Amino acid sequence: AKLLPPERMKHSIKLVDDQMNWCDSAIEYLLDQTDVLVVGVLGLQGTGKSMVMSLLSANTPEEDQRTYVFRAQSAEMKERGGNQTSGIDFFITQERIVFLDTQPILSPSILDHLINNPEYNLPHTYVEMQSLQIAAFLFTVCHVVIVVQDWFTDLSLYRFLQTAEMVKPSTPTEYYPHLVFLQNKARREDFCPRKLRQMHLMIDQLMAHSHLRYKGTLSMLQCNVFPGLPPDFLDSEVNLPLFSLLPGYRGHPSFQSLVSKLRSQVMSMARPQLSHTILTEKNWFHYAARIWDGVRKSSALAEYSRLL
Amino acid sequence: MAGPVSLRDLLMGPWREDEICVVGIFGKTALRLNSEKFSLVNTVCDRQVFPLFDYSLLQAYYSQESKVLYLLLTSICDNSQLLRACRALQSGELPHAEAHEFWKHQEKLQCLSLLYLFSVCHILLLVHPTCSFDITYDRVFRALDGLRQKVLPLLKTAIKDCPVGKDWKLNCRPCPPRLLFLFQLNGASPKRRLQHALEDQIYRIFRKSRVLTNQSINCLFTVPANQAFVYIVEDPVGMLLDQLRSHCTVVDFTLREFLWQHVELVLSKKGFDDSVGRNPQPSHFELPTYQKWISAASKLYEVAISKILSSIKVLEGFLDIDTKFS
Amino acid sequence: SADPDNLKYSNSAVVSRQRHDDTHADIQNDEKGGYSVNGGSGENTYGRKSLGQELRVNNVTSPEFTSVQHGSRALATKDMRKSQERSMSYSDESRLSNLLRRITREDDRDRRLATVKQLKEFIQQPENKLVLVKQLDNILAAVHDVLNESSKLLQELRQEGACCLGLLCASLSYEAEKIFKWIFSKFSSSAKDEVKLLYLCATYKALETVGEKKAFSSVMQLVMTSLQSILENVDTPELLCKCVKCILLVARCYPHIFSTNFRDTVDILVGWHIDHTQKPSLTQQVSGWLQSLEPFWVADLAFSTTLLGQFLEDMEAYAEDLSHVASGESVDE
Numbered sequence: 011a012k013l014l015p016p017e018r019m020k021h022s023i024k025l026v027d028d029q030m031n032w033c034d035s036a037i038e039y040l041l042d043q044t045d046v047l048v049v050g051v052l053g054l055q056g057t058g059k060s061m062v063m064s065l066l067s068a069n070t071p072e073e074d075q076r077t078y079v080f081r082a083q084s085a086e087m088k089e090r091g092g093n094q095t096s097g098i099d100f101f102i103t104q105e106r107i108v109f110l111d112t113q114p115i116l117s118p119s120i121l122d123h124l125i126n127n128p129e130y131n132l133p134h135t136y137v138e139m140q141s142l143q144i145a146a147f148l149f150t151v152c153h154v155v156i157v158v159q160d161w162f163t164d165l166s167l168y169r170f171l172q173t174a175e176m177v178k179p180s181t182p183t184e185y186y187p188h189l190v191f192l193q194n195k196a197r198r199e200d201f202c203p204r205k206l207r208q209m210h211l212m213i214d215q216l217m218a219h220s221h222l223r224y225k226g227t228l229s230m231l232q233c234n235v236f237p238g239l240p241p242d243f244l245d246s247e248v249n250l251p252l253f254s255l256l257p258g259y260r261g262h263p264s265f266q267s268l269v270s271k272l273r274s275q276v277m278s279m280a281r282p283q284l285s286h287t288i289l290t291e292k293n294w295f296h297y298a299a300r301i302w303d304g305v306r307k308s309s310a311l312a313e314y315s316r317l318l
Numbered sequence: 319m320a321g322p323v324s325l326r327d328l329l330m331g332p333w334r335e336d337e338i339c340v341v342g343i344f345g346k347t348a349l350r351l352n353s354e355k356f357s358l359v360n361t362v363c364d365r366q367v368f369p370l371f372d373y374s375l376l377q378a379y380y381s382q383e384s385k386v387l388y389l390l391l392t393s394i395c396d397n398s399q400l401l402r403a404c405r406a407l408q409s410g411e412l413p414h415a416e417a418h419e420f421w422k423h424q425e426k427l428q429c430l431s432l433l434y435l436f437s438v439c440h441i442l443l444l445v446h447p448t449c450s451f452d453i454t455y456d457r458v459f460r461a462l463d464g465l466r467q468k469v470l471p472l473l474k475t476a477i478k479d480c481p482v483g484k485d486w487k488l489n490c491r492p493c494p495p496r497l498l499f500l501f502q503l504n505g506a507s508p509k510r511r512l513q514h515a516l517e518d519q520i521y522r523i524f525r526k527s528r529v530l531t532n533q534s535i536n537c538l539f540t541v542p543a544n545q546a547f548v549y550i551v552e553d554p555v556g557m558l559l560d561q562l563r564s565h566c567t568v569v570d571f572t573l574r575e576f577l578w579q580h581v582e583l584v585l586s587k588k589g590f591d592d593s594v595g596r597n598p599q600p601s602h603f604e605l606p607t608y609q610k611w612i613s614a615a616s617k618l619y620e621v622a623i624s625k626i627l628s629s630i631k632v633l634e635g636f637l638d639i640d641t642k643f644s
Numbered sequence: 645s646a647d648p649d650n651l652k653y654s655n656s657a658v659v660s661r662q663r664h665d666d667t668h669a670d671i672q673n674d675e676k677g678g679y680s681v682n683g684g685s686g687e688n689t690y691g692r693k694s695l696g697q698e699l700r701v702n703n704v705t706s707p708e709f710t711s712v713q714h715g716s717r718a719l720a721t722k723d724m725r726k727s728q729e730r731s732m733s734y735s736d737e738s739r740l741s742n743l744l745r746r747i748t749r750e751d752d753r754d755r756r757l758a759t760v761k762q763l764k765e766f767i768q769q770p771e772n773k774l775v776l777v778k779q780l781d782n783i784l785a786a787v788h789d790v791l792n793e794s795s796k797l798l799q800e801l802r803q804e805g806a807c808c809l810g811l812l813c814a815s816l817s818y819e820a821e822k823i824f825k826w827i828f829s830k831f832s833s834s835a836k837d838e839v840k841l842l843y844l845c846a847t848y849k850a851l852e853t854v855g856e857k858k859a860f861s862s863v864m865q866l867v868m869t870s871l872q873s874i875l876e877n878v879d880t881p882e883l884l885c886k887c888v889k890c891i892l893l894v895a896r897c898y899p900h901i902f903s904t905n906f907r908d909t910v911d912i913l914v915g916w917h918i919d920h921t922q923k924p925s926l927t928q929q930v931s932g933w934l935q936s937l938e939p940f941w942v943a944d945l946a947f948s949t950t951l952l953g954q955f956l957e958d959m960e961a962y963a964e965d966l967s968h969v970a971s972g973e974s975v976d977e
């Protein structure tokens with residue numbers, strides 16, 4: 011009964027420190043399995059990129075926020091800005107699914123911390139480098155990139171993702187992960203057929219030339235009798251006597267149902283092979299650390315910093 | 319009787335002077351029935367000016383009961399014109415390079431239309447329904463000083479024969495426009511503190527990025543007053559469905575005080591002397607009139623919408639970094 | 645005793661002396677002479693201290709009338725009179741005889757300020773009057789609650805605040821139609837004369853607002869059909885006269901209260917459609933839409949059994965445009 015000893019986590023683990031420093035505290039929870047899913051999330055300051063990871067990896071929609079693996083925003087929202095997720099965290103669900111809730115790319119809280127206290131000329135051109143370093147590390151290492159967005163069609167996000175691909179260090183065919191566009195805090199409008207078609211058209215025209223698998227295996231789980239009207243793509247929206255006890259017309263699927271149907275997709279996401287080998291959960295950490303050193307001291311960023 | 323149009327508004331030859339005070343309205347908005355800028359225009363003047371139901375279609379509207387000329391910009395950053403852009407780019411206008419150049423041209427037209435607000439305006443109201451200061455605007459505001467300076471003589475040489483006055487022709491604008499950012503709420507006394515936090519964050523950002531200098535810079539500080547409003551969490555058709563549930567059974571300014579606290583400094587000629595650093599205190603109120611303002615804006619639009627201005631777009635080098643990197 | 649009086653002149657001794665108030669005579673004027681001299685922070689404490697020591701029949705109320713030096717020095721002190729009159733409850737000095745005229749003088753001066761002195765010096769007056777009745781007080785109040793406030797520069801909630809005065813005071817004086825008569829005598833004069841002017845529009849809207857401020861309370865008598873003439877003489881000076889695109893908000897609200905007293909018996913309702921059917925001329929203002937749709941509800945309440953034809957047919961593409969984001973106008977439509 012001892013030949014099958016499992017291992018689980020309780021809270022997140024930060025690979026990249028607050029000052030962008032790699033950590034070796036995740037190997038303790040790693041194993042020698044081959045098929046290891048690695049889903050990362052990128053988004054704005056208050057785009058809600060950790061609550062999604064928490065509800066997808068271990069937690070559920072019906073559970074206290076303090077119990078979430080990744081700390082959410084409870085009292086920091088009302089206070090000065092946000093950015094409670096300093097660095098890239100780490101968590102491997104019982105299903106061996108690695109989760110990476112990075113910091114908010116292009117966040118004002120990080121800029122304020124930098125201004126109040128680094129090898130650059132201005133802190134504003136530095137918060138954009140950390141964002142690029144995290145976007146390139148989330149593309150060369152992760153199998154899925156959950157691009158969370160508080161509000162829909164942030165042209166800055168679509169123009170930044172296309173800039174993170176340019177920094178993606180290839181030659182370890184170029185490995186390009188998927189792209190799940192989560193519309194966190196979605197209103198009743200986002201769940202309309204016309205709104206769905208408009209969103210698909212907009213995200214297909216903005217990401218028309220990305221080379222990233224942003225379309226194909228999403229947005230067709232919980233809807234009406236609707237056949238595929240638009241060129242469907244990866245887009246999963248997440249909302250925010252007896253007659254008298256009728257709940258109001260939410261207009262969107264239940265939060266629990268959407269969380270479940272998104273977790274099922276994330277777990278079922280295609281897990282293509284890594285750069286050049288299987289890179290088991292143990293080899294992966296030895297493959298994501300080298301990528302971190304190669305991107306933090308890469309020529310792509312060294313040249314992009316001068317253009318800023 | 320006022321028509322929400324800018325191109326037709328400037329092409330005029332009633333309310334002549336009016337001691338108007340123009341207010342620019344730009345920023346990003348989400349896909350909704352009523353745009354954020356339209357809702358702001360409707361709530362400010364206390365009337366539904368824009369009744370609900372790939373260019374920068376800048377439209378103006380004058381309020382006789384308030385003497386305010388709201389100029390709202392439809393920059394590509396907005397998701398209303400971006401939808402039409404992606405629709406026209408889907409069926410018939412493009413390769414990767416051509417699409418990138420199209421997006422770059424759209425962003426350049428947006429920056430041009432925005433410089434038309436930082437050049438002829440008094441107050442400015444941003445729109446970002448996230449409650450988080452978009453750092454990108456920094457690189458945009460740092461990309462407008464270049465155009466506001468290099469394209470400065472190109473604008474002075476086109477507004478000389480205008481009754482705007484001496485200071486307006488000197489600095490090319492009626493007065494330093496005050497930025498009053500306006501963010502919408504999504505999840506949340508609690509808002510009173512968030513406003514001050516965002517104000518401090520924006521101040522620190524613009525001070526560390528040189529976006530808010532101690533002189534006649536493109537923007538202003540607004541230290542005494544407040545320049546960070548937070549909208550309450552209505553817009554779509556859900557009030558009727560929420561009224562069915564009821565029919566079957568049977569401090570903290572709001573879009574007027576937060577904006578009037580700054581509009582009075584221009585309507586009363588108080589000015590925008592909110593400067594720090596023991597400077598010379600250059601504060602030219604320059605309270606314009608509808609006739610003079612239209613006379614100036616006609617030339618400003620004819621020059622920017624551009625003989626040499628069209629050749630200054632390459633002088634930015636702050637938003638097309640992707641092209642140079644590639 | 646007398647020592648705490650001097651100690652009340654830091655705040656430690658003042659607080660220690662404030663406890664003796666729950667138990668002399670020289671302390672009555674002490675707070676009135678100290679609260680009006682010290683800062684604003686340590687003013688309400690003193691104002692409330694002496695309000696629990698004695699009956700203060702004529703000692704406390706004496707120097708309060710002589711507080712014309714400053715506004716706050718008078719408001720805080722008159723708060724003492726209010727509290728003592730609300731605490732006595734035995735009808736010795738509380739809304740009393742000719743002495744009470746002092747407070748009337750106060751009411752005659754509270755209009756000079758921004759109505760801050762009226763926030764409390766008018767709300768407790770009707771409650772202080774429990775046995776003795778007075779009707780001239782209503783007229784002396786309305787002389788400024790609607791004239792000075794008509795152009796007091798917002799001057800927005802002061803009208804509603806003073807409305808409660810007549811509500812709590814107009815219960816008596818069955819023959820209260822004299823106020824309406826005096827407000828409507830110059831009503832038609834200012835309506836028909838002379839031309840489109842700001843002063844005119846202002847006084848007209850003020851008189852109209854008074855028409856409802858006073859009507860809200862006058863429901864007792866009679867009404868021997870005089871309300872029909874009121875409706876006619878309120879509709880005539882606004883339907884054809886202006887005709888100026890002024891603020892019809894109160895102009896549209898006046899007929900509301902005017903007709904709210906007749907259910908079905910009889911009226912000239914035929915002459916009401918043009919009054920209401922002609923008001924829907926887009927598009928101003930957001931509050932004007934509600935103030936005009938409410939007359940629609942009033943007319944529908946008067947069309948119990950005799951109305952039909954073009955009335956409803958005019959609801960095809962005319963009033964359906966008031967279904968926008970505005971929640972108020974949404975429900976009012």
Ligand SMILES: Nc1nc2c(ncn2[C@@H]2O[C@H](COP(=O)(O)OP(=O)(O)OP(=O)(O)O)[C@@H](O)[C@H]2O)c(=O)[nH]1
Nearest residue numbers: 055056058059060061082083093094095114194250
């Ligand atoms: N994403 C999301 N957030 C919500 C929702 N409802 C309330 N919130 C609040 O919005 C905040 C943002 O969510 P998070 O994902 O936890 O934020 P985060 O991942 O820490 O990202 P940062 O703001 O950069 O720290 C949370 O702290 C919640 O308190 C919701 O439906 N979706």
Ligand SMILES: [Mg+2]
Nearest residue numbers: 059060094095
């Ligand atoms: Mg987080």
